[PDB]
Structures are given as C-alpha cells and as structure tokens.
Design a protein around this motif. Structure first.
Motif, PDB file in Angstrom:
ATOM      1  N   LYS A  87      21.556 -23.135  44.049  1.00 32.56           N
ATOM      2  CA  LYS A  87      22.182 -23.259  42.876  1.00 32.56           C
ATOM      3  C   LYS A  87      23.880 -23.341  43.243  1.00 32.56           C
ATOM      4  O   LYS A  87      24.220 -24.438  42.678  1.00 32.56           O
ATOM      5  CB  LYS A  87      22.079 -22.020  41.916  1.00 32.56           C
ATOM      6  CG  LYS A  87      20.437 -22.244  41.261  1.00 32.56           C
ATOM      7  CD  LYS A  87      20.232 -21.317  40.061  1.00 32.56           C
ATOM      8  CE  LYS A  87      20.453 -19.845  40.299  1.00 32.56           C
ATOM      9  NZ  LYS A  87      19.962 -18.985  39.543  1.00 32.56           N
ATOM     10  N   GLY A  91      25.343 -26.307  42.148  1.00 34.65           N
ATOM     11  CA  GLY A  91      26.088 -26.212  40.925  1.00 34.65           C
ATOM     12  C   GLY A  91      27.405 -27.286  40.932  1.00 34.65           C
ATOM     13  O   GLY A  91      28.770 -26.986  40.304  1.00 34.65           O
ATOM     14  N   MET A  96      23.508 -29.380  37.072  1.00 34.62           N
ATOM     15  CA  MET A  96      24.305 -28.441  36.365  1.00 34.62           C
ATOM     16  C   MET A  96      24.428 -28.694  35.126  1.00 34.62           C
ATOM     17  O   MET A  96      24.946 -27.828  34.088  1.00 34.62           O
ATOM     18  CB  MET A  96      25.713 -28.457  37.026  1.00 34.62           C
ATOM     19  CG  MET A  96      26.216 -30.095  36.979  1.00 34.62           C
ATOM     20  SD  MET A  96      28.105 -30.107  37.247  1.00 34.62           S
ATOM     21  CE  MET A  96      28.609 -29.973  35.488  1.00 34.62           C
TER      22      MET A  96
END
Length: 106
Positions: A87, A91, A96
């Motif tokens: 992530k 991200g 996201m």
C-alpha cells in the motif's frame, strides 16, 4: 523498433520478482518459517529488503509514521508487513482513490 513504443513500462514497479526476493531476505531474519518478526528487529529487516521495498536507514521514523498492527505483545505479522509495504508503495498514484469512494459510504 520505434513507432510501437506503447510497450514501455508494461508492468508496475512491484512485480513478482519482488515477492520471491522478499522471502529470500525474510529467511535471513527467520529460518524457522514462523512468518513473524520482532519490532526491535524490524527497522533492520526494513533495510534488508530490496527496492521497491527497501527503506534506507536511519529512516526509523518512517516506520513509526506507518505503525503496522502488532501481534502478540511484542511481535509483528508478516502478512501485515507485506500488505502495508504494498500500500505504501501503491499509495503514490494508483488505487489510492479506492478510499475516496468511502466518502459516499454504502
């Protein structure tokens, strides 16, 4: 070849080559296949991985800012370490938005 340059970057930074490499380093910090690691040893392991999973030292803070769920009083879950790292590296500018959909809620 030119012209057909629509191939460049035909894969995301985080590929399978990383998945296996991650286990390669993991084995060094855990030959018991326990799949768990101590926090005091995490900062080390954290710099033991290779890009796009390598966090150079002394970036210890970056580890605290992303405090990953901790199992048994003093022990962290690999599944958690792996995901948080997927992530954190994702991200950036992809998937996201999936969170932005939470606003509407359902």
């Amino acid at each position: 070849e030119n012209f057909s340059v629509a191939t460049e970057e035909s894969a995301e930074p985080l590929s399978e080559d990383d998945f296996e490499m991650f286990y390669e380093v993991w084995e060094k910090f855990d030959p018991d296949a326990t799949q768990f690691i101590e926090f005091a040893k995490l900062s080390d392991f954290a710099d033991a991985l290779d890009p796009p999973l390598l966090i150079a030292k002394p970036n210890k803070v970056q580890l605290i800012a992303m405090d990953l769920p901790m199992v048994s009083g003093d022990r962290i879950h690999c599944l958690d370490i792996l995901f948080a790292f997927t992530k954190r590296v994702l991200g950036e500018s992809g998937e996201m938005d999936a969170l932005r959909i939470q606003m509407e809620e359902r």
